[PDB]
Design a protein around this nucleic acid. Structure first.
Lengths: 22, 113, 158, 127, 241, 145, 129
RNA sequence: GAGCCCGGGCUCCGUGAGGGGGGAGAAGUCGUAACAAGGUAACCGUAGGGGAACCUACGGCUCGAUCACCUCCU
RNA sequence: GCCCGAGUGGUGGCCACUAUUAUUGGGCCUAAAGCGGCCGUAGCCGGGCCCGUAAGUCCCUGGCGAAAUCCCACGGCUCAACCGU
RNA sequence: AGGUAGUUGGUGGGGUAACGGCCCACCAAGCCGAAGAUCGGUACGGGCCGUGAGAGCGGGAGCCCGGAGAUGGACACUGAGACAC
């Protein structure tokens, strides 16, 4: 679980933060 | 210049006050009286006295600390100093924020907080 | 009894004599006692150790009980015997020993700086000084114009 | 004309205070004036709201003097020299409650408000 | 509302007159006159409500134009007349006198006494001040002003007992208030007591200036020199007899 | 010390504590801001009239299936799209498209549609200023336009 | 440190009580406690005490009859009017009978019942019942 | 001395292609992740990698594993 | 058949229940929730013993917090609501 | 989370029914703030009101009391009084 979520949250964050940074 | 002020208090040792003192002119002593402590002397003939009182809270059954600054005009016959009680008269306005003049000073070398 | 300060460890239970007036099987005059004190402060010993040697040699457990009454304003004891003569350090020994030590630390750290623990007691001794300062100011052994710092610690010791 | 009060400036704590009313008639005010030195006297009577007519001097030609016994006169004056407030005023000869002026013999110090009372007399300055 | 308040409501009508409170939506409002508004009583009331002589105000007003009542030994006709306190009011068509006296309670009541006491009206004067022509004058807070006392004080500060010959508009028999004299208390929550003054010793700083008194009962009353009114050395009757 | 300062002059701490901790009641917070009043259209109101854009039927929830009668109505001043649950059996009948339909809530304003219905926050009372429970009974009044 | 030395007396005294020891020892000692035990004894709750004043401290050795149920200090030590007494009466005490809400007063120190008979009040200090 | 206007800046209301997630629907598909040592104990913070569940490294923790083997403790 | 009764019910809001906002009168090992640990500023809170003041604090008096509404009495309207004292 | 430039004070003066930076000339650099200022939201305020065993919580409706307004916004006369439903 919290492994999952942390990396899902991180990936969401990055990918989206990539989309914001871009 | 030097006349009895009443309240059961003696007037300053020296006198030469400007017309914004109740020993000259048309600004006169009247009314209620307080006591508080000098924060600062920095402005000219002008002195901050901040009072402490307690207030009650009905909900909690307890008290609180509140602190009301009051602006006080010091007469050039006597100089206010930090950290001593000063006695204030209720008079008509000097200015936007100055409604008070200092009447009788009890001075002190001691300081807490 | 205890206070585990910067520790978890209960403090020593060392306890005073419950004597309230002094032994008379022990015998000294107000004059003789005063000499003994002055001689020891002349050596370079300090008031705790002065009270220590008098205890171990001359058999007086605390000075207050023996001396007062001889001017019953208060108890007469070592440094109050000293001040009337002018042998008292204007800094209280409490505050002095403290600062004294402190300046020694700094020199170690000077040469050795990779020291957690040694760094961490610098922080633990200053902050006792600070306090000891703070209250004295208000009591009056040290003027209100003072404030504590590591250059104003290296000046008091020298 | 001048509005005020005077509750519409700022708080002594740097708050903005906003007016929560309009004008009140009683609490309006008029503009300052320039009372000139001249040979003629230009007066006007004006009715206050307390219901009392008060004189405004818009010019004057006589002040005149007082000692420390107090013997008044009505005689000629000449140029206003030294006004406390602003030296600009001392060029255009604006009389004030504390103005200083040249009289016939001695300088004299104005000691009355000619913008509500309608009077000009003075007391001699001694060197 | 930024003009003058020229109406009064019943609910806004003070209960120191003992008015009826919900009779209508509007009460009779005193005009200015002799004495204070929430210390007075309207002529209308004494007629319509107090003494029943009226049903409608068309009655009362007629009654006051013809002359069933004189106030202060003098005729009236304004049917909005504040009748003063410690006051002389006369019925001339029957020969009645009432004092406008406060009760213990604090409502205004009329207390009936004979015609003889209706020539005298104790004044303690509200102030005393110099005027031009080198005179002083005697004040009151029912307004009534007198001139003459033969230069300077000759008597007391203001705590006076005056004898006013009320039909005659004249002042007679002046008498101070002293430390064994009588006082009737007209203002304060100690009203309707008449007593013997213990002393006039005071703590004057600011507004309060203290006077004590102990009555026949012995109830210690602290009133202002002003709330204190000098009934004299005892002449008119006590309220609640 | 079980939490709180107790001491004469401390009270202020008390006084701010409560308030700080009050805002953990969703309901309280929400009202004191007015989120109840801003979000779930109405502008707060008891009820709202609106024009029946169309009639739609939706499915029931998890253990359930049955065709609930729902309208789509547009509130008129609110100007917001509301899908809505209609009381009664036959009903969907008595409601013509483009009659006025007054609308209310149903079963706590919280958001809670009743157990069966997913969405529906709201209720219908009326068809052309005469209600639905009056139109389930034949006698009482019958509809127009 | 300590504060409320009284309270740390009282609280022992009660937890002392609840066990059913014979007598107590309270290492810190005082007027407050001294006085309070005095008033306590006066009502009778306790037997006899001796304090020995050591150059260190007063200590109270207290004799326990068995009477006391519960006796505790007040936390902020509230001021209480003589009108508000009845409220503070119903709350803290177990019923109308007992009446040692020990307050501190203008007259000295008293219980609740000894306070009421005089007629005077103030800030609360402790309780006993 | 108002309203009024003009040029710019900042903010807010009605409304818009497109875009994010939630509580769901539980008849399609992939896998077996966890819950039994779940069939490689599990979790944990950090880092990389994989379609997914997730795997691995390093450090921690037992809310840890089943006998066995060894060691202590009323 | 039960309730209530010219009412009864629906939606919405507020308060109670909710010691689910803890003053009265809540918790926080594992249920939500202890900061990874320390320092000391502001704050709150403070061992004993004597003396001054009496600021808080209590007691008494006195000025005062409009009417209305509330509570109690008596009186009025057939009764009460409502009003008057 | 820092705000403040008639801005805080001083001297002298104007204007006003009148004190006052109300306004203004000159001089000074204060004034306010973590005992929460400033800014933003929301809101007439009070008597009361609802509820609750109490403590408390919510509320400003008739009515009374005080203030503000009169299509938005400014402006004077006339009158004791208006910047005038």
């Amino acid at each position: 679980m919290r492994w999952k979520w942390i990396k899902k949250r991180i990936r969401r964050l990055k990918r989206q933060r990539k989309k914001e940074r871009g | 210049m030097m006349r009895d002020i009443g309240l059961r208090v003696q007037p300053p040792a020296e006198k030469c006050d400007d017309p914004k003192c109740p020993w000259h002119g048309n600004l006169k002593i009247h009314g209620r009286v307080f006591e508080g402590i000098v924060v600062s002397d920095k402005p000219r003939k002008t002195v901050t006295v901040e009072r402490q009182y307690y207030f009650y809270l009905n909900k909690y059954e307890r008290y609180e600390l509140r602190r009301s600054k009051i602006h006080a005009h010091n007469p050039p016959c006597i100089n206010a100093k930090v950290g001593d009680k000063v006695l204030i008269a209720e008079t008509r306005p000097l200015s936007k924020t100055k409604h008070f003049v200092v009447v009788a000073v009890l001075e002190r070398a001691e300081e807490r907080r | 009894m205890a206070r585990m300060h910067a520790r978890k460890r209960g403090k020593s239970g060392s306890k005073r004599p419950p004597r309230t007036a002094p032994p008379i099987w022990v015998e000294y005059t107000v004059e003789e006692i005063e000499n003994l004190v002055v001689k020891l402060r002349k050596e370079g010993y300090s008031t705790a150790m002065i009270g220590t040697i008098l205890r171990d040699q001359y058999g007086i457990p605390s000075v207050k009980l023996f001396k007062d009454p001889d001017n019953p304003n208060r108890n007469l004891t070592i440094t109050r015997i000293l001040e009337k003569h002018g042998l008292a350090p204007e800094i209280p020994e409490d505050l002095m020993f403290l600062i004294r030590r402190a300046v020694n630390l700094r020199k170690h750290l000077e040469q050795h700086p990779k020291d957690l623990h040694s760094m961490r007691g610098l922080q633990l001794i200053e902050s006792k000084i600070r306090r000891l300062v703070k209250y004295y100011k208000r009591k009056g052994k040290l003027p209100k114009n003072w404030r504590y710092d590591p250059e104003t610690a290296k000046l008091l010791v020298r | 004309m001048a509005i005020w009060q005077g509750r519409s400036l700022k708080k002594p704590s740097g708050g903005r205070i906003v007016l929560a009313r309009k004008k009140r008639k009683r609490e309006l005010g008029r503009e300052p004036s320039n009372t000139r030195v001249a040979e003629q006297d230009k007066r006007k009577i004006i009715r206050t709201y307390g219901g009392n007519r008060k004189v405004r001097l818009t010019a004057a030609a006589y002040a005149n003097v007082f000692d420390k016994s107090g013997k008044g006169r009505k005689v000629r004056i000449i140029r206003v020299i030294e006004n406390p407030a602003n030296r600009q005023f001392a060029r255009r000869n604006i009389i004030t409650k504390g103005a200083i002026i040249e009289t016939e013999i001695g300088k004299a110090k104005v000691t009355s408000r000619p913008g509500q009372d309608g009077v000009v007399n003075a007391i001699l300055l001694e060197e | 509302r930024k003009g003058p308040k020229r109406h009064l409501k019943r609910l806004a009508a003070p209960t120191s007159w003992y008015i009826e409170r919900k009779a209508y939506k509007w009460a009779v409002r005193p005009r200015p006159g002799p004495h204070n508004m929430r210390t007075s009583i309207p002529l209308l009331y004494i007629v319509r409500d107090y003494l029943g002589y009226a049903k409608t105000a068309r009655e009362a007003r007629k009654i006051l134009n013809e002359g069933k009542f004189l106030v202060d030994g003098r005729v009236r006709k304004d049917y909005k007349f504040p009748v003063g306190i410690m006051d002389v009011v006369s019925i001339p068509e029957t020969g009645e006198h009432y004092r406008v006296l406060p009760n213990r309670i604090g409502k205004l009541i009329l207390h009936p006494i004979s015609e003889d006491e209706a020539f005298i009206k104790p004044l303690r004067i509200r102030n005393k001040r110099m005027i031009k022509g080198a005179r002083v004058q005697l004040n009151f807070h029912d307004g009534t002003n007198h001139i003459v006392s033969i230069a300077e004080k000759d008597n007391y500060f203001t705590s006076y007992t005056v004898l006013m010959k009320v039909p005659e508009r004249e002042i007679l028999e002046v008498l101070p208030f002293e430390k064994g004299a009588y006082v009737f208390v007209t203002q304060g929550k100690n009203v309707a007591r008449k007593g013997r003054i213990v002393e006039i010793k005071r703590f004057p700083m600011g507004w309060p200036d203290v006077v004590t008194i102990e009555d026949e009962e012995g109830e210690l009353f602290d009133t202002l020199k002003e709330y204190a009114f000098v009934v004299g050395t005892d002449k008119p009757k006590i309220s609640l007899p | 010390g079980k939490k709180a300062p107790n001491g004469e002059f401390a009270g202020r701490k008390l006084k701010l504590k409560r308030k700080k901790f009050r805002w953990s009641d969703i309901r309280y917070k929400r009202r004191v801001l007015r989120l109840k009043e801003k979000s779930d259209p109405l502008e707060g109101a008891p009820q709202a009239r609106g024009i029946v854009l169309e009639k739609i039927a939706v499915e029931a929830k998890q253990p359930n299936s049955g065709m609930r009668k729902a309208v789509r109505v547009q509130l008129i001043k609110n100007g917001k799209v509301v899908t809505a649950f209609c009381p009664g059996d036959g009903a969907i009948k008595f409601i013509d498209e483009h009659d006025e339909v007054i609308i209310e809530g149903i079963g706590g304003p919280k958001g809670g549609s009743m157990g069966d219905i997913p969405g529906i926050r709201y209720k219908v009372v009326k068809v052309n200023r005469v209600s639905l429970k009056e139109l389930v009974k034949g006698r009482k009044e019958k509809p127009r336009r | 440190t300590l504060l409320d030395p009284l309270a740390n007396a009282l609280s022992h005294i009660t937890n002392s009580e609840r066990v059913g020891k014979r007598e107590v020892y309270i290492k810190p000692a005082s007027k407050l406690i001294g006085e309070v035990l005095r008033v306590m004894q006066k009502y009778g709750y306790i037997g006899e005490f001796e304090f020995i004043d050591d150059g260190r401290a007063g200590v109270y050795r207290v004799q326990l009859l068995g009477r006391i149920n519960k006796a505790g200090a007040i936390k902020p030590r509230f001021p209480v009017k003589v009108s508000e007494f009845e409220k503070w009466e119903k709350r803290f005490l177990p019923a109308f009978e007992f009446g040692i809400l020990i307050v501190s007063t203008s007259q000295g120190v008293m219980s609740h019942k000894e306070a009421i008979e005089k007629g005077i009040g103030g800030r609360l200090i402790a309780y006993v019942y």
